[PDB]
DNA sequence: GGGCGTGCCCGGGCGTGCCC
DNA sequence: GGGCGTGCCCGGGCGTGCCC
């Protein structure tokens, strides 16, 4: 009955977890991940590689959904949307609706969804197993507004929720991470990690 | 025959109690809870998360009702309503009647009720059990006037009464807490707790 | 073309000016006037005597209009109205519309007007010459909200504009004074006069 | 043939100049004017009083037009518009089109225009002579975006151009001033004046 | 990569109807 | 008449995209 999707980690019976590349903290690196904060820092529209790791092979027809929600209780019930400026920037790839924050690049089977009851946006691709000898699959996500965008996220932190779902709709696994989209991911990761150590 | 709902705690056979988040006492925090006073301090229209804890699973069709009453004997028999200024502010979410003080956000099955005999307002949502691994459910309430509003609460303290009711109308459990809606919940919580220690 | 009436003093060819009684500055005096501030301090709904002085007798059919405007440039274009709480208090004398801030008591020929283009309220009585041996006429005004009323004046200072008008509509004279309606006119007059001396 | 209106001062045969109120430089004053910079600093949507001074009375039917242009050569040819976020904020007064940056408040004869060839916006009111004894007329303007608004002014300075025009369209006079719309006009005026003194 | 923006967060303290 | 309320004003200082 809640209109807020759950963020609770559920690694589930398939041993589902996420992985992130090691990029560093150079000032304006395009994408970097803080394990201490479970938080991805990235630039607007840049590639954000997310690895999907499983211990057991999901069944055929499994899907991978990504959605954003506001992290703070005060904002959770508000749908995460692109700001009006970027919604009109005509920067679509021909498939993503202009209002969707999260896109997937490099996938011929991407689907963009708007929930008819909650109005929330999500992007789905088929789950594909790793190639022989590889331990994970990688999806390239893109975030199409800065966290600071006026009339959109407006400086509020978001979580991305990644769910592994079978074709019937059963939740097989769920993981999430915080996101800041910003001009200087390396600067901002280092600032937030230092504030955690000094004041957290 | 009384037109005043009971505030008596009834944890009942399901072991029903409330829980509140730890927010601190920063001057203008949006919502904070004092265990010593059993009192929530929050800002107008801001999210107030309330956790529902049970020891035994309620039956299907159970409902959660919230209602406000004035705390002091002198004012108990007066219906708690929004003040005339805020009633006309056209700030409805499309479901809550403009006169109702307490709203629920983020729930697709909210129902707003006016008692035909007492004229008192209440807001009801279905009870949903916690997700596996979680110990409680959380409802987001909003209070749509300040305690100080002239022509409404007019500086008088209120209690929020939360009842767990089966579909037939049986009371399964009841809990309550005092509320102050104010501009500076952290200041005011600290003032009230200090006055309790010094003069209570 | 402006929707804001002029406040410019125009003593005019009849030598029109206002006079006020000497009341003192006892804490909760019902009405008191500060010449230094050209400001009347009064309590809600209490009698405020205003004297009309002329050097030459106005023609028959002359009228006396009172209107309120906000003093600050930022608020001048907003119509001064009673707040929603007091508008519903059913405290009318049978003639004053419930939304009008300024009333006249003790006059059998009072007229309450709403301007069809600016929506502003005014109250009008016939001008009557002083009795033989007297130098002025007195009108008893009442202000039906406090300056602090939420959803009304909301702590903003107002001016009352008194105009002497002939029956044809010509402006014969205009005077104005600031008003604060408050619980403690004597306290507040003394505070404002001291602030003028110390910080003005 | 140019699509950029001229900003050249033309006090003209009527001796047309502008005047501004003395407000000070308190940090968040709603509006303040720097003579040294010929620059108004104001908050979003707040009243900005502008005085019109003439030496000779303009003919009947004279109009007062206000328009914004970007100050820097690099941006002059771009039409000044509200940003997409504020354009959708449904904050219209019922007359101003939602895309127009400059509004006039308190005038029953305001007209909002879009030039059919340059697409530029302007707002026009009738010229009214000062009341007897007064030396100027005052118009209340409002600026409906911050200078910093993303997708609108985007941190770029603008000029407001005020023209006095006869009913036939002849330019009788022209004046202009720079504008910054910001959260803290007093801070920002002081910063800009200090930078002028130290680095200009 | 260093450092300036600039809307907004933050705690100190003044209001002002009402309690005493 | 003395003095406590309590929403809001106020200046200090942190953001964060962008200039350099
Ligand atoms: Zn954006
Ligand atoms: Zn209220
Ligand atoms: Zn009132
Ligand atoms: Zn804008």
Cα separation of B93 and B20, whole Å?
25
Cα separation of A94 and A82, whole Å?
16
**Do residues C52 and C18 lie in contact, with contact meaning Cβ atoms separated by under 8 Å?**
yes
**Do residues D2 and D115 lie in contact, with contact meaning Cβ atoms separated by under 8 Å?**
no
Yes or no, beta carbons of B83 and C87 under 8 Å apart: no
Cα separation of A112 and A121, whole Å?
7
Cα separation of B96 and B125, whole Å?
13
Distance D87 CA to F19 C1' (A): 28
Structural tokens at position A61: 């027809």
Cα separation of D160 and D39, whole Å?
10
Q: Experimental technique used?
A: X-ray
Longest pairwise C-alpha distance within chain A: 47
Distance D26 CA to E19 C1' (A): 36
CA angle D31, D153, D161 (to 5 degrees): 60
Structural tokens at position B10: 């009834």
**Do residues C141 and C44 lie in contact, with contact meaning Cβ atoms separated by under 8 Å?**
no
CA of D47 to the centre of ligand 2 (A): 27
Per-residue CA distances from C70 to C6, C74, C150, C157, C179 (Å): 12, 9, 15, 6, 10
Mapped to the 3 state alphabet, what secondary structure does D174-198 carry? EEEEEEEECCCHHHHHHHHHHHHHH
Per-residue CA distances from D195 to A20, D23, D136, D186, D200 (Å): 46, 21, 33, 14, 7
Question: What does D113-154 look like in DSSP terms, one character per residue?
Answer: EE-TTT--EEEEEE--PPPTT---EEEEEEE-S-TT-TTTTT
Buried b (16+ CB within 10 A) or exposed e, C78-117: ebbbbbbbbbeeeeeeeebeebbbbbbeebeebebeeeee
Residue A95, number of CB atoms within 10 A of its CB: 13
The chain A residue lying nearest B129, using CA atoms, is: A1
**Do residues D183 and D148 lie in contact, with contact meaning Cβ atoms separated by under 8 Å?**
no
**Do residues D109 and D17 lie in contact, with contact meaning Cβ atoms separated by under 8 Å?**
no
- Note the Cα C173 to chain centre separation in Å: 15
For the domain spanning C1-200, the CATH number is 2.60.40.720
Query: Over the Cα atoms of chain B, what is R_g?
Result: 16
Structural tokens at position D82: 């509200």
User: Any contact of D with A, at least 3 CB pairs below 8 A?
Assistant: yes
The edge-to-edge listing of strands for the beta sheet with A17-19 is A17-19, A48-53, A137-143, A102-105
**Which run of H or of E encompasses D160?**
strand D158-165
Burial class (CB in 10 A: 0-12, 13-18, 19+), B167: exposed
Cα separation of B136 and B128, whole Å?
9
Contacts of B47 in chain A (CB under 8 A): 73-74, 76-77
**Do residues C79 and C119 lie in contact, with contact meaning Cβ atoms separated by under 8 Å?**
yes
Mutate to test the interface with D, among A81, A91, A150 (most CBs of D within 10 A): A150
**Do residues D110 and D104 lie in contact, with contact meaning Cβ atoms separated by under 8 Å?**
yes
Burial class (CB in 10 A: 0-12, 13-18, 19+), A80: buried
Structural tokens at position C51: 């004297």
Nearest to A1 among B125, B131, B132 (CB): B125
Structural tokens at position B4: 């005043």
Would an 8 Å CB–CB cutoff place C1 in contact with chain D?
yes
Structural tokens at position D103: 């509004």
Counting ligands in written order, which one lies closest to the CA of residue C146? 3
Question: What does B126-144 look like in DSSP terms, one character per residue?
Answer: E--PPPTT---EEEEEEE-
What are the binding residues of C for Zn(2+)?
Answer: 83, 86, 145, 149
CA of C148 to the centre of ligand 2 (A): 14
Cα-flanking dihedrals φ and ψ of residue B198, to 5°?
-85, -30
Distance C182 CA to E20 C1' (A): 20
Structural tokens at position A127: 């789950």
Structural tokens at position D17: 């100049």
**All residues at 6 or more sequence positions from C31 whose CB lies less than 8 Å from its CB, including other chains:** C21, C23, C40, C41, C42, C43, C46, C47, C48, C49, C185
Counting ligands in written order, which one lies closest to the CA of residue D182? 4
Would an 8 Å CB–CB cutoff place D150 in contact with chain A?
yes
Cα separation of C158 and D149, whole Å?
34
Residue nearest to nucleotide E9 (CA to C1'): B28
**Do residues C50 and C138 lie in contact, with contact meaning Cβ atoms separated by under 8 Å?**
yes
Structural tokens at position D167: 């009913």
**Do residues C136 and C19 lie in contact, with contact meaning Cβ atoms separated by under 8 Å?**
yes
**Do residues D197 and D34 lie in contact, with contact meaning Cβ atoms separated by under 8 Å?**
no
What are the binding residues of A for Zn(2+)?
Answer: 83, 86, 145, 149
Cα separation of A41 and A30, whole Å?
8
Go through chain A and tell me how many residues it has. 200
- Strand E: positions under 7 A of a protein C-beta atom: 1-3, 5-8, 10-13, 15-18
At a 7 A CB cut-off, the residues bordering strand E are A 26-28, 155, 184, 186-187; B 26-28, 150, 155, 184, 186-187; C 146-148, 155, 182-184, 187-188, 191; D 146-148, 155, 182-184, 187-188, 191
Go through chain D and tell me how many residues it has. 200
CA angle C93, C96, C102 (to 5 degrees): 110
- Strand F: positions under 7 A of a protein C-beta atom: 1-3, 5-8, 10-13, 15-18
Distance C157 CA to E16 C1' (A): 14
Yes or no, beta carbons of C77 and D49 under 8 Å apart: no
- Note the Cα A114 to chain centre separation in Å: 16
Counting ligands in written order, which one lies closest to the CA of residue A87? 1
Cα separation of C190 and A115, whole Å?
62
- For the four alpha carbons of C102, C108, C109 and C113, in that order, the dihedral sign comes to positive
Name the residue ranges covered by the structural domains of chain C: 1-200
Beta strands in chain A (DSSP E): 17-19, 31-34, 39-42, 48-53, 63-70, 102-105, 111-114, 121-126, 137-143, 158-165, 171-181
CA atoms within 13 A on the CB side of A152: 26
**All residues at 6 or more sequence positions from D144 whose CB lies less than 8 Å from its CB, including other chains:** D44, D45, D82, D86, D91, D96, D100, D101, D102, D103
User: Closest Cα of chain D to C77: distance in Å?
Assistant: 5
**Do residues B180 and B70 lie in contact, with contact meaning Cβ atoms separated by under 8 Å?**
no
Cα separation of D93 and D85, whole Å?
17
């Amino acid at each position: 009955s809640s209109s807020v999707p759950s963020q609770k980690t559920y690694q589930g019976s398939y041993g589902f977890r996420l992985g992130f590349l090691h990029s560093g903290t150079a000032k304006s690196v395009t994408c970097t991940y803080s394990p201490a904060l479970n938080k991805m820092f990235c630039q607007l529209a840049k590639t954000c590689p997310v690895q999907l790791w499983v211990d057991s092979t999901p069944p055929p027809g499994t899907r991978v959904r990504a959605m954003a929600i506001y992290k703070q209780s005060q904002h959770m019930t508000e749908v995460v949307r692109r700001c009006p400026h970027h919604e009109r920037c005509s920067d679509s790839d021909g498939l993503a609706p202009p209002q969707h924050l999260i896109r997937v690049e490099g996938n011929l089977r991407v689907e963009y969804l708007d929930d008819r009851n909650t109005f929330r946006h999500s992007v789905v691709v088929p789950y594909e197993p790793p190639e022989v000898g590889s331990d994970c699959t990688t999806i390239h996500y893109n975030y199409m507004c800065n966290s600071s965008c006026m009339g959109g996220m407006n400086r509020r932190p978001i979580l991305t929720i990644i769910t592994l779902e079978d074709s019937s709709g059963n939740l097989l696994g769920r993981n999430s991470f915080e996101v800041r989209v910003c001009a200087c991911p390396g600067r901002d990761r280092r600032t937030e990690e230092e504030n955690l150590r000094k004041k957290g």
